[PDB]
Each structure stands twice: as C-alpha cells, then as structure tokens.
C-alpha cells in the first residue's frame, strides 16, 4: 500500500467542463441522480477526452 | 390615505339618482341641479343629517370632466412562477442545498431602503424528483413564512399539478406532505397579499417581492438553480377600500378635520361608502376667477362616486343627467 501519484499530479484532478480539460489534469464527472457515486474518470489523449475506466458488461 | 389636492377636493356619494330636490329622502340620494340656461352646476346631496349642496360650478370655467370604469383602480396581486432551470438541470442534484431567498421591499417602513428577507431550504437527495422538490420547497417556505409568531402575512404559497395546470393548491404552515399527494407538480407559485386595512389609519398597501435564488455547484461551477417568472395574475383588490379612505379624507374638507383626535371632545361623522363594494368614479375640475384685480384662479375638484354593478349603469345615469342639465358631454363608460 502506497500513494498512487505525487500530489502534484493529484492536485490536477479537477471538476469542470469537458471542453476546458487539457492534459496534465484528470477530470471527474460527479453523478447527480446519485449523491456520492461518480460517473467517469477522463483523461485527454489527442484532443479527445477518453475514459480511464474499462467498460464492463454482463 | 392622504392625497394631494389642487387647492381642494370634495366628494359626494351617489347611492341613488333623483329627479328633483323634493325627492331627496334617503341619505345617499343625489340629483344634478342647473339653470334653465347653462350657467351654473351644483348637486343636491342628501346627507345623513339633512340636505346639502355642492359648490357652484361656473360652466364657463370647467377645465375637465371625466369618469373612470372602476377597473383602473384595482391592484393585481403580483404572481410569480418558480421552476428548476433546465439549463443547469431539470432535476435536483443530490447533495446540494437548494436555497431560495424571498426579498421583500416596502416592509414596515414605506421606502425601499426598508427590506426584509425570508428563506427556503431544500437539501436534495438521490432520486428526488422535481415534484417532490417543489413540494418540500413550498412547505419550507410556508413554515418559515407563517410561524404563528410572525406578525405580518407576507405571501401566499401555491402549487400547480401539471394535470390541472390552472387550479393552484395552497400550502400553509399547517399543511403536510401527506396532504400533497400528486406527483406532477410543475412549479411553485408565489403571490402578494392584501395587507390589513383600517379606515383613515392603515391605507391599502402591498409588500413587493422578487424570488432570488442561491448558487449550487453543478458539474463544476456555481450556478443558479431556478427561474423566477412573472406570470399574469388572477386576483384583484376590488377598489372598495380606496374610495372609503377617499371619502374619509374628502369629508374633512367639508366638515370635521379632526376625526377622533380629541376623543371624548369630537364630532361623529357618518360615511356612506361601503368598503366591500366596488365603485365607478366621476370627477370634475374647474376654477373660480375674481373681478378687475382678482384674476387669479382657484382650481377646484368636485368628485362623485357611484356603485358599479359590472355594467357601469349608475354612473352612466349620472353622466346622462349631468349632461342633460349642464350641456356638457361627459363621455359615458
């Protein structure tokens, strides 16, 4: 057990508009219908804002 | 209800129209009197204490004469419509304090520097549909507004089911969620109130309000969660109290101006306006000029009030008789 990233790279975990998320920062999309849950973690790669969570099916 | 006068204003009530002065029996009977020519106009008004008569109008010196339809004096209660802002979100976001701020102007004072604020609070939960939010928001408003120990009644809260869309359902501090059972509550309505009124003491007045919203944190930014719309009202004040306070004031130009001040040592004045009815108003303006050096005018206003049956029947009868006896052409209602 140890920390996952230096706090410098964790201070750039933000909550905002997908259109203003550049690199050197990760995006979190909070859920509305559910209070504490999250919807997706996102990271831009080539202008597109892709997810870091692998899709899981039945 | 003190008003401004162009050197004077007098009031006479027309509870019934007569043909001659030999028929003035009841304490509201009136009749217009004028010469066989058209040189002077005056009214024989039956008072509760005998016949009287207005000042004499020189028809060469009549400035303006016009009636009102009794609906130009009704005050429509300012109605609002609160709603969730679809742009932000068409539903509440769990974990956010959906506060509402009712800003009141013309609180106890009479200026607008005299302000007063009343709040509502709804902390949203997961799965809180919109109807439940409006319900809980309306109730929080009622509770915070009408605490049994709150002197002035400020606003009336309402709710509208999307099924009806017209029949607003009330929400009092005695109301309970159990009483509000529907699930398609579309919006929250807020409306003015007829403040208390006392003849000669407490004039007809209202407290203006505007629903102001507080910020919530939607996806990343602080944004207002609602919409304060000014919808067309559906309720009026029937003008009865304005005329009563008008008579109260305009009968001091014709009598006791103290109206109760030195209490045991007063004169008792009777009033013929029924506050609770609705009146249509006739108003005449004119002046008096003197001779060689006394050319200065003294403008005057003689005011009449009749009862509006909805068709302006009585006031039309007045205007007919006045025009027949004076040659004027006061336009009917």
Q: Is B67 exposed, middle or buried (0-12, 13-18, 19+ CB in 10 A)?
A: buried
Q: Looking at beta carbons, which residues of chain A come within 8 Å of B125?
A: 35
CB contact under 8 A, B221 and A16: yes
Q: What is the dihedral of CA B82, B85, B86, B92, to 10 degrees?
A: -90
Whole-angstrom Cα distance, residue B226 to residue B85?
4
Establish if A35 touches chain B: CB-CB under 8 angstroms. Answer: yes
Instruction: Name the experimental technique.
Output: cryo-EM
User: Residue B149, Cβ neighbours under 10 Å: how many?
Assistant: 5
User: Residue B181, Cβ neighbours under 10 Å: how many?
Assistant: 8
Q: Looking at beta carbons, which residues of chain A come within 8 Å of B220?
A: 14-17
Query: What is the least distance, in Å, from the CA of B136 to any CA of chain A?
Result: 17
Whole-angstrom Cα distance, residue B136 to residue B142?
10
Beta bridge partner(s), residue B10: B302
- For B95, the closest chain A residue by CA position comes to A35
What single DSSP character describes residue B202? B
**CA–CA distances in Å: residue B86 to residues B90, B92, B124, B218, B224:** 4, 10, 16, 12, 11
Query: What is the least distance, in Å, from the CA of B215 to any CA of chain A?
Result: 16
Whole-angstrom Cα distance, residue B302 to residue B250?
10
CB contact under 8 A, B94 and A33: yes
- Comparing CA positions, the residue from B231, B251, B243, B213 lying closest to residue B97 is B213
Whole-angstrom Cα distance, residue B329 to residue B51?
27
A-B C-beta contacts closer than 8 Å: 28
Whole-angstrom Cα distance, residue A27 to residue B93?
19
What single DSSP character describes residue B299? E
Which residues are within 8 A (CB) of B119 and not within 5 positions of it... i.e. 6 or more apart?
A: B99, B100, B101, B102, B144
CB contact under 8 A, B94 and A32: yes
Length of chain A equals 58
CB contact under 8 A, A35 and B95: yes
Q: Looking at beta carbons, which residues of chain A come within 8 Å of B132?
A: none
The phi, psi pair for B189, rounded to 5°, reads -100, 145
Establish if A43 touches chain B: CB-CB under 8 angstroms. Answer: no
- For B89, the closest chain A residue by CA position comes to A32
- Comparing CA positions, the residue from B299, B248, B236, B295 lying closest to residue B273 is B248
Alpha helix segments (H runs only) across chain B: 130-145, 240-250, 313-326
- For A30, the closest chain B residue by CA position comes to B219
- Comparing CA positions, the residue from A15, A19, A22, A21 lying closest to residue A38 is A15
Q: Which one of A14, A30, A35 has the shortest CB-CB distance to B126?
A: A35
């Amino acid at each position: 057990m140890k920390r996952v990233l230096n706090l410098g790279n964790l201070s750039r975990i933000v909550e905002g508009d997908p259109n203003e998320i550049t690199d050197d920062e990760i995006l979190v999309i909070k859920d509305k219908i559910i209070e504490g849950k999250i919807i997706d973690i996102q990271k831009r790669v080539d202008g597109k804002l892709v997810s870091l969570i692998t899709e899981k099916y039945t | 209800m003190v008003i401004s006068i162009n050197q004077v204003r007098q009031l006479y009530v027309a509870k019934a129209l007569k043909a001659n002065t030999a028929a003035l029996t009841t304490a509201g009977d009136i009749v217009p009197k004028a010469d066989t020519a058209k040189t002077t106009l005056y009214f024989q008004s039956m008072s509760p204490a005998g016949i009287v008569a207005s000042d004499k109008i020189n028809l060469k010196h009549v400035l303006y004469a016009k009636a009102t339809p009794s609906e130009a004096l009704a005050h429509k209660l300012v109605r609002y419509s609160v709603t969730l802002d679809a742009d932000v979100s068409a539903t509440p976001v769990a974990g956010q304090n959906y506060i509402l701020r009712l800003a009141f102007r013309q609180y106890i004072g009479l200026s607008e520097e005299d302000q007063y604020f009343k709040y509502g609070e709804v902390i949203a939960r997961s799965g809180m549909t919109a109807s439940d939010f409006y319900k809980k928001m309306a109730i929080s408003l009622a509770k915070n507004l009408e605490n049994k120990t709150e002197s002035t009644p400020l606003v009336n809260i309402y709710l509208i089911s999307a099924a009806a869309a017209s029949t607003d359902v009330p929400v009092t501090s005695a109301t309970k969620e159990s009483d509000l059972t529907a699930t398609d509550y579309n919006q929250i309505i807020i409306e003015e109130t007829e403040q208390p009124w006392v003849l000669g003491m407490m004039p007809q007045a209202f407290i203006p309000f505007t629903p102001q919203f507080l910020t919530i944190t939607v996806d990343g930014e602080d944004r207002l969660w609602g919409v304060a719309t000014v919808v067309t009202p559906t309720k009026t004040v029937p003008d009865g109290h304005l005329i009563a306070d008008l008579e109260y004031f305009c009968m001091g130009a014709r009598g006791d101006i103290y109206r109760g001040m030195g209490y045991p040592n007063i004169i008792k004045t009777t009033y013929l306006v029924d506050p609770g009815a609705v009146y249509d108003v006739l108003d005449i303006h004119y002046f008096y000029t003197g001779s060689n050096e006394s050319v200065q005018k003294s403008e005057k206003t003689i005011t009449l009030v009749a009862v509006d049956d909805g068709s302006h029947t009585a006031m039309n009868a007045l205007i007919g008789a006045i025009n027949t006896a004076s040659g004027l052409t006061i336009a009917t209602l």
